[PDB]
Amino acid sequence: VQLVQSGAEMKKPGASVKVSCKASGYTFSAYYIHWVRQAPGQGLEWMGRINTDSGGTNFAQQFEGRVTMTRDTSISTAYMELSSLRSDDTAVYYCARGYDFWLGSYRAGGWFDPWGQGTLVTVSS
Amino acid sequence: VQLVQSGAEMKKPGASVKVSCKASGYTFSAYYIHWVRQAPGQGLEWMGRINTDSGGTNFAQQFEGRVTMTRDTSISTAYMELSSLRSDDTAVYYCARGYDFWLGSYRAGGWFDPWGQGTLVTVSS
Amino acid sequence: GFIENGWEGMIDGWYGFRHQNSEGTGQAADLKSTQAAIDQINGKLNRVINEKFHQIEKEFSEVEGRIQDLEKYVEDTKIDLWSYNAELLVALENQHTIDLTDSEMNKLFEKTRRQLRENAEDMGNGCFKIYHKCDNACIESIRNGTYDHDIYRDEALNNRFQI
Amino acid sequence: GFIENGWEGMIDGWYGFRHQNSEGTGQAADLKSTQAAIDQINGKLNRVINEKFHQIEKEFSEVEGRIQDLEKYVEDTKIDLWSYNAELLVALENQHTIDLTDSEMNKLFEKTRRQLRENAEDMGNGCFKIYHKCDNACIESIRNGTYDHDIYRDEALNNRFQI
Amino acid sequence: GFIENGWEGMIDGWYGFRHQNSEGTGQAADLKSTQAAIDQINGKLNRVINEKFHQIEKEFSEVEGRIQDLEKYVEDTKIDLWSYNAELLVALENQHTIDLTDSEMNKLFEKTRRQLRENAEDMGNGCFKIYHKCDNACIESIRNGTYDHDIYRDEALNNRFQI
Amino acid sequence: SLVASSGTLEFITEGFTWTGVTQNGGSNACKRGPASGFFSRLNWLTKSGSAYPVLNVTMPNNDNFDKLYVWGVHHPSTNQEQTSLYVQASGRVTVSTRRSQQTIIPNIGSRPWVRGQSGRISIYWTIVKPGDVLVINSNGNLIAPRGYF
Amino acid sequence: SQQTIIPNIGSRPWVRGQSGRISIYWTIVKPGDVLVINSNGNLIAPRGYF
Secondary structure (H helix, E strand, O other): OEEEOOOEEEEEEOOOEEEEEEOOOOOHHHOOOEEEEEOOOOEEEEEEEEEEOOOOEOOOOOOOOOEEEEEEEEOEEEEEEOOOOOHHHOOEEEEEEEEEEEEEEEEEEEEEEEEOEEEEEOOOE | OEHHHHHHOOOOOOOOOOEEEEEEEEHHHOOEEEEEEEOOOOOOEEEEOOOOOOOOEEEOOOOOOOOEEEEOOOOEEEEEEEOOOOOOHHHEEEEEEEEEEEOEEEEEEEEEEEEOEEEEEOOOO | OOOOOOOOOOOOOOOOOEEEEEEEEEEOHHHHHHHEEEHHHHHHHHOOOOOOOOOOOOOOOOOOOHHHHHHHHHHHHHHHHHHHHHHHHHHHHHHHHHHHHHHHHHHHHHHHHHHHHEEEOOOOOEEEOOOOOOOOOHHHHHHOOOOOOOOHHHHHHHHHHOO | OOOOOOOOOOOOOOOEEEEEEOOOEEEOOOOOHHHHHHHHHHHHHHHOOOOOOOOOOOOOOOOHHHHHHHHHHHHEEEEEEEHHHHHHHHHHHHHHHHHHHHHHHHHHHHHHHHHHHHEEOOOOOOOOEEEEOOOOHHHHHHHOOOOOOOOOOOHHHHHHOOO | OOOOOOOOOOOOOEEEEEEOOOOOHHHHEEEHHHHHHHHHHHHHHHHHHOOOOOOOOOOOOOOOOHHHHHHHHHHHHHHHHHHHHHHHHHHHHHHHHHHHHHHHHHHHHHHHHHHHHHHHEOOOOOEEEEEEOOOOOHHHHHOOOOOOOOOOOHHHHHHHOOO | OHHHHOOOOOEEEEOOOOEEEEOOOOOOOHHOOOOOOOOOOEEEEEEEOEEOOOOOEEEEEOOOOOEEEEEEEEOOOHHHHHHHHOOOOOOOEEEOOOOEEEOOOOOOOOOOOOOOOOOEEEEEEEOOOOEEEEEEEEOEEEEEEOOOO | OOOOOOOOOEEEEEOEEEEEOOOOOOOOOOOOOOOOOOOOOOOOOOOOOO
């Protein structure tokens, strides 16, 4: 069970970035994929999650209108598209599989495992 | 599962009539056999039932002393014998299998199925 | 096993329910268990149901000796081995059929018992005693799998324990 | 299962009861299940216990060649196949016998549990805790199947729940 | 079948537990049942996993007739019988493996149920509801077989029946 | 195997006519008491005088069961013995039915000394079905059958 | 391979007017092989091959 991502991107401000996350070792369409962002020197910041079966997505109420998440079940890869880039958007972007803790008929918490290697996106002129 | 009866009999008053009911398609000795009378232009009238295993019989307190019911498990046929025929005894005689509704350790209700085709018995001089 | 006999009034299924309440008695069949039974039976039947063109002579018109005896011996060996195989196969598969059917019945009983929770108590003959008013919709809910035990729990507990 | 060890003090049956009450302890056997298990075992034995008169030669004194190796091959193949069949048959039969005996024991336990109803509560080791005064006639009634639970229910529930 | 889905997150055993309480959720595996299943499966594997030196010729370059046809027939019979034997053996062993694994899961469920006694009630999804405060030491006690039910019985009965 | 599955050593003698030959031949290797005997169910034909005529005998199947004729061909040790018992230099035995035939040409040579004799007798069998017929034609070297099993 | 048959003279049973017999033999010639038939007498020759 592992998650492999793309490489670094030196995008310019006012552009768009797409980061890929390929799943190997498990059924891609059976678990959620979460995107976490870590600014250089600061802590992790949850961006959103995507359902790999029905295509549903749930963002945070800070990235609405700037992040669109898509999936590709044929090649088992989930994409994150981030628009209206800014200088503060430079960070390491992580893709993580979310495991829900199902206690029979109800779910209670969970964790993120595995995590991808992270892609460093830099925004500069 | 069917019950086939005898033919029409034009017996004279002050005599006896024997009506047969042959059972084909089910175990004859496992279900009660009931005899129902329908006069022309009137409703159905229960006459009695015969236990096909122990030979036990149970009539109504209106045919006592006039109806005898016998069984023949070898040929699977139930016989109803009615004596002292009178003018009011002209009717259509049916044989119906009684299905008791068993809810485990006790019985509660049931129905009559299947029925015979009926024999028209006429008493006239 | 605890069920005594079968019901000959049931012709629309293999397993089912019978009930009595204030509004009367009734019968209904469970499709999920009957369908599972027939699915297993057919899946087993399809595995039970060779192409040989030129073979040795199996019946002879003369008395020859060594070779003819060898051919007869080979044929008898093959026939006896395949007859044993057929007998063992049918015996084992009939056994497994009988146990799978009884297991389906037991599964249905256990699922109904688990649904009823503390609202009913088993009577030992394959029947439950519901300790509350259970009308036709109540029995329907028990049968289709949408029975809520918390809306009858207080009355069932009052009837069950305190007299 | 939950029943750990067999009782070597039982020489009058296969499955039985042990009890303790105010008047002491006791042992008894249940013949209905012992006879059922015995009947199944004898029936499975009767299916296990051919008349061939003239066959091929199986031991030779000269070295000849093609024919002799053919007959040796036929006989060796037959012996190997029948050895495999015997091994498989005895293994399957022994597994089934063990399973059926355990099933009979569990059946006796479940029948007793359904008999006791809310009057007794399972302790996990094959033993029941009857929550009322159960004299020797009481134990007898539980054993032969004539235990009326509605006449001990009040005291059993009083002792079971309220301390 | 009353347990719907498996757990891909428990990789330290075959059968285990999952719990929720005031101090959070957790997961632990059962060594005794996993070990029992593995030992049975390996014992079955070892029984499945002949020394022939000189046999008849099986490939022919000339057309001869009676003897060559007898040799071909004998070999074809042997291969067909052994192929059928292999298929039957693998089907039987796979069926037994699946049945025994399900039985082990049911055994663990029944053992936990008999541990809990009147202090818990099954929810029907293959997994329990406990009617008293049960910390991680409590779950540990249930898991390792040292769960004392009498010290929680009073509050469990109060919570179960009296609302 | 054939005789073992038959289950009966039942012999019925038939009236075979052998003209021009001496019958009931024997050898010192088969002493039946103090004399020189032979097999009971086989007949050793030998030249009579100084001529061994070509034998042509027939015996049909007027019964309703199979017969088994056991006959033989004598292989002499030397050519001198062959001419001293059989006139001809090279014998021949053919025994045929309406669907099968067996023709044996005898072999002359010194086999190992057994029981006083360096020659051999080769034993052959013929089976006659109902409605068939056995014809025995021999220019020499014939151990005739006395009947059938 | 070779097959050499010596004819043998004798009075066989009368069938269809004939007291003699014909013995039928067969030879299979593989690709690249040659068939040679040498007969001093008593030969029922083949007219071809099957």
